[PDB]
Amino acid sequence: FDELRIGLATADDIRQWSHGEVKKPETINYRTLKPEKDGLFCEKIFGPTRDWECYCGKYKRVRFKGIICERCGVEVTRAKVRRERMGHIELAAPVTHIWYFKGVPSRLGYLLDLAPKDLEKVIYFAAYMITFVDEERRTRDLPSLEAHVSVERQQIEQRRDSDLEARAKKLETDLAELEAEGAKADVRRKVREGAEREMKQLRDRAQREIDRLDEVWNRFKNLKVQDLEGDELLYRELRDRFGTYFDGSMGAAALQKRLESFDLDEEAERLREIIRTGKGQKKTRALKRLKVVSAFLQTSNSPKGMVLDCVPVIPPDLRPMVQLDGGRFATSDLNDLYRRVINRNNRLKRLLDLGAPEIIVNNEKRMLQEAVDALFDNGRRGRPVTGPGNRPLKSLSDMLKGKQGRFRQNLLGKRVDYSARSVIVVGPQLKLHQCGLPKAMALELFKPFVMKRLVDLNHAQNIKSAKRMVERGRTVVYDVLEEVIAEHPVLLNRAPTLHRLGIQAFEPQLVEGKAIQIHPLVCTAFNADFDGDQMAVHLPLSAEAQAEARILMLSSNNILKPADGRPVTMPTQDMVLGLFFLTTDSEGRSPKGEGRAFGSSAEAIMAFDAGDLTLQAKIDIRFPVGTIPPRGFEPPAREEGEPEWQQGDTFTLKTTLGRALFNELLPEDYPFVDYEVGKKQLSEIVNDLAERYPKVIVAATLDNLKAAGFFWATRSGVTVAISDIVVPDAKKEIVKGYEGQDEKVQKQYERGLITKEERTQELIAIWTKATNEVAEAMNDNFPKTNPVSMMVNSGARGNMMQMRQIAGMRGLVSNAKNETIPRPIKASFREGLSVLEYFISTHGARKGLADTALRTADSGYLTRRLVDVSQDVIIREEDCGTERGLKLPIATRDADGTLRKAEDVETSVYARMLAEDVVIDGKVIAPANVDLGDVLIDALVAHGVEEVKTRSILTCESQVGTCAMCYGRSLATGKLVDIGEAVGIIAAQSIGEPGTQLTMRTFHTGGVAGDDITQGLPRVVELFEARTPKGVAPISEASGRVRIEETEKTKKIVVTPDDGSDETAFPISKRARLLVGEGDHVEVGQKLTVGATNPHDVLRILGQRAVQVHLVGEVQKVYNSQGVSIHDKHIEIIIRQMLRRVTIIESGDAELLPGELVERTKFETENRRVVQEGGHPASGRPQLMGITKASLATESWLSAASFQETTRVLTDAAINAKSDSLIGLKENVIIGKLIPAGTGLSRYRNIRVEPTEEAKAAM
DNA sequence: CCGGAGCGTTCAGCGTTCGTTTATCTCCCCCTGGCACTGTCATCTCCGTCAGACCGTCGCA
DNA sequence: TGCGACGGTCTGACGCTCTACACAGTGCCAGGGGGAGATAAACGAACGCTGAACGCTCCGG
Ligand SMILES: [Mg+2]
Ligand SMILES: [Zn+2]
Ligand SMILES: [Zn+2]
């Protein structure tokens, strides 16, 4: 389990694994249903089908286990041994493996210098091959064979001359006799014409016999190894004419005979020689050939296994034939493929037994080879073997691949026991850490524990009686159930589970109904909505699992979302509206009892219950001792003649009753919050509470906030009648004026003075102006009292666009294929659309639905790719010895006379760590190795700093992984990241979580294609794939003079760098936009055409820091366009995992291949060991590569096998004979060992616990 | 005042009879072998992916 | 050889579950070797049968 090897399995290994020969094709008997002898499903080879029974019906008893039956040879043992015992099929003629031959040429490898079409010709029995030639023996006796050929030519010419003389005599004789007989007037001309026709035909066959002799001579003269011969007649006449000189064969046996004598070390030698000198695509050919051949040199596995003689068989359980109801049978397609191979092998053996024609034997060997190929890969070549006539049979590989393969459907993700699922309901009566399971769910989940406690409580005599009562379901079972499930957490989980908070451990609690009762305060972190969403409940089982549920997983410890550090367990739908109504100012609502002193909040509550004081009214309310005053009230303390402090003393405040209640919700140590709460300030309050109070106190305060928010939202005066939604009264006249001027334009267009396109453009412009103006009128119309504004201005639920298109006009709405109708929807949803206006609304609606479906699909795909590329990076050191960092800006866009901090400081500089101390006047403002929060950043920007050096992960160098300090504080705990936290998966999920939340598509292309770059999720995936964007913006290599060259066929730009640097020319199309000055000043910074720069050349000509900044800035500017906030360290992790590979050149002294994928640490180690040897180091360039290519090119082939290309990497590992170290997480999920992240580390599992001496002395 | 016949238990003679095997006689099964006018090249997939690579191929320059 | 483009090749293409299902057109008989399965006999052992025999308490003239 330390190491998991792979390689080519030669026939010796197959025979070692095998336990017999599957000689016969049949599987089971047709009446007794017993497995056959020495055939498929054989009990002698694979093992018995029952337990400790044998085939011949004897030896049914268990006592004499491990013996061999004399009658039938079946070993008596368990029935599960048929899951692990394999045999083999002995093939009469060798066949090739379809994985290596007929694949990617990087894995075919050109090990023999043959074209793939030549292989198709040779091993599919359509063209011959010469396997061996006695070249030195052929060249030794050249004068003798030349003399024999000369003798043959001489006798050919002699017999031609004799035949010519005889034909001349015959022609003269017949001409003389037909001119002397005089049978006809011109019969001599006819016989002469016939004679000359005979002349030309016999001369033709003479030149033809000469031609075949010449062609066989020049064919034999240039015969060598690796020679093919398509024509069977030509090879036959070489065999007949010339003997024991060249050896050839037919089919895959030719490859075996070539490979047994194939000399490959000198092949690598001369191939290195042609690597050293040459030019062109020959370099690439020899490069791939040397990268494949050198695998067989260093490794000890012989290359014999590419062509095979034996075929191992799957054990019979894994290709079962199971009995069903009604007598029907169901078998796997592997049994059918094995049956086909066995039938054809038996028929080939039968043909080899007797004397058979070569065409029939060759066709039999071809169909055998094709059947073996179909067994290894059904559908790789040609029409797949269908079978029933509907679908192709699934081969071995066809279930090692894809969504139906073992890697992705049964190894990474598995079904589980002790799990349950039902719909969800909201329960406000629960705490933060409680969930309500039904009775049936809790009984079926906790059934074995219930039986154990029932036997312990002796309600049942033994286990069977306990099970009988549980199945019957008596009330004592429910009582002991309620006694059991407490102090036993369960894992709740939603199916999408987009991010880390999709699994949260609650404490179960018995409730009635058939639905899981769930705290509303946490349902937004699940993305849960109570509309039939079904949540599965998984049960942690051992002590370790429920301990990790209690400590790591509890719902009262997951306040802060790891995506941005913002609180996520304070939802907004209903409680925020209640607190808004509780704490808002009295505007538009009649304030009763406005401006009267109150002794305490109790007297105010009594007055409010009486009815003479409204909830929001500016009153002077005195507060008892211990209440902390507001942040703004401490300096404006009540004026004092003697020295006094208002910090712990009583005070009077000008605040409403509702704010006093709200500060009764918050803890006593919190300062009196004295403003409109809404949502954003509530998020800030919850963030401050989480940052400055322990977890249990924060859970209690949010539970109080939930309860009071619901209580006051019931009485908040929100409701939606149709009078509450109000249309602007000015909308009628605004629309009337705009349609009047539209009518004026329409009669203006009717005269043809303007085109249709210009009219459409100006019409959509003026109608956009109209909808913006009526939106402004709508904002100016509504008061603060109506509930729609009260639930949209409080951050509760809704945006201003929705209220704009319910009250005001719906505005402009798109057509099919992304254009705009000149006529907008002038009717509001309160007024109600007309027929066709509603039709054009449906145009946009269905496109939006299809867009969000495809968007969530591609978001899941990007999330998976990010998880693969960004995994196996884990915090593994406490601190580095480094001091280098990143120059992240802190103060930007300062005005005249003032300094302003950066706008995106909250996602970039926050939650990081300083690389070194900062000084402005010789004194440190912020110490090194501390987090950067609000107060410290405010102090720095007040002192007058412009940029800071943050110790980020891109500059982190370490012996293994990354350290905690260089990564920065974790955004999910609010503290420093613990050693072992799997930061890579958290980063990948945080990038992939708002993929469905982007909801972006290009509104209009402007009538031209290609002018607009990719937007939204396609832009993000194009950035992370390191691909060249669709809008390419070239960058000048050096500063110099740049001018345009407007060639008519294709535009052209030319930049001439100064200082004697070489001219570089960039090709640009005849497209509309180019922003560079002709004969103007240019440098490396700017871009010749506005567009997305290709980041490959950015890295090439600017540096690693510049390309890191560019990538981070681009993805963050995509994400910030929608409102989703992702911290930049999550991107920086993927970018660091992205630039790790380095491309090397001129590696003539570093003794490895130049111009491939080389790891950075390995390249540095090679440089160190070659400068230790004295040789000059090889050059190297960093290579920005995509997430997919970096995921495939990994050390552990199990992780790459679990990814997309699972056939290429398996063949690659088999050829390279690479064994993977099990450092990683996919390769530890598959095996079932503990993952090396978090609790699974070595430094945590190696603890020994013992009580102290005074502890055992006490008891 | 010990004798006797009757009664309880305990083993060896021969006499049949179960306990356990064997080859013989119907019945069915199963694999190989046999058909003697002539009748000598079928079969129908596969389209409104799909997106952009990734690649070697391959003819033109 | 460098060029494009033409081409084949190849891969996935968010997620469980309330739900969930099954699947079709062209020969025939005789002769012969195995093995299960019924028949009656047969080798071997013990299971009954013959009362007889060892030996006591026994009512007894
Ligand atoms: Mg839902
Ligand atoms: Zn047996
Ligand atoms: Zn570090």
UniProtKB/Swiss-Prot annotation:
Where Zn(2+) 1 binds, per the record, is at: C54, C56, C69, C72
Q: Where does Zn(2+) 2 bind?
A: C880, C956, C963, C966
User: What is a single molecular function from GO for this protein?
Assistant: DNA binding
Q: Which GO terms describe its biological process?
A: DNA-templated transcription
Q: Quick one: where's region Disordered?
A: 379-399
* CC annotations in GO: DNA-directed RNA polymerase complex
Superkingdom of origin organism: Bacteria
Keywords, comma-separated and alphabetical: DNA-directed RNA polymerase, Magnesium, Metal-binding, Nucleotidyltransferase, Transcription, Transferase, Zinc
Broadest EC class assigned to this enzyme? transferase
Report the EC number(s), separated by commas if there are several. 2.7.7.6
Keyword Ion transport on this protein? no
For Mg(2+), which residues are the binding ones?
D529, D531, D533
Any keyword Transcription? Answer: yes
The prosthetic group or cofactor this protein requires is: Mg(2+); Zn(2+)
Q: Name one Pfam family in it.
A: RNA_pol_Rpb1_5
Note how many cofactor molecules are bound and how: Binds 1 Mg(2+) ion per subunit. Binds 2 Zn(2+) ions per subunit.
Q: What reaction is this protein's catalytic activity?
A: RNA(n) + a ribonucleoside 5'-triphosphate = RNA(n+1) + diphosphate
Q: How does it assemble?
A: The RNAP catalytic core consists of 2 alpha, 1 beta, 1 beta' and 1 omega subunit. When a sigma factor is associated with the core the holoenzyme is formed, which can initiate transcription.
**Record-linked NCBIfam families:** PRK14906.1, rpoC_TIGR
| PANTHER family documented for this protein | DNA-DIRECTED RNA POLYMERASE, DNA-DIRECTED RNA POLYMERASE SUBUNIT BETA
Function comment: DNA-dependent RNA polymerase catalyzes the transcription of DNA into RNA using the four ribonucleoside triphosphates as substrates.
Q: Which family does it belong to?
A: Belongs to the RNA polymerase beta' chain family.
Q: Which HAMAP family does this one have? A: RNApol_bact_RpoC
- Protein known as: DNA-directed RNA polymerase subunit beta'
Question: What is the source species?
Answer: Streptomyces coelicolor (strain ATCC BAA-471 / A3(2) / M145)
Phylogenetic lineage: Bacteria, Bacillati, Actinomycetota, Actinomycetes, Kitasatosporales
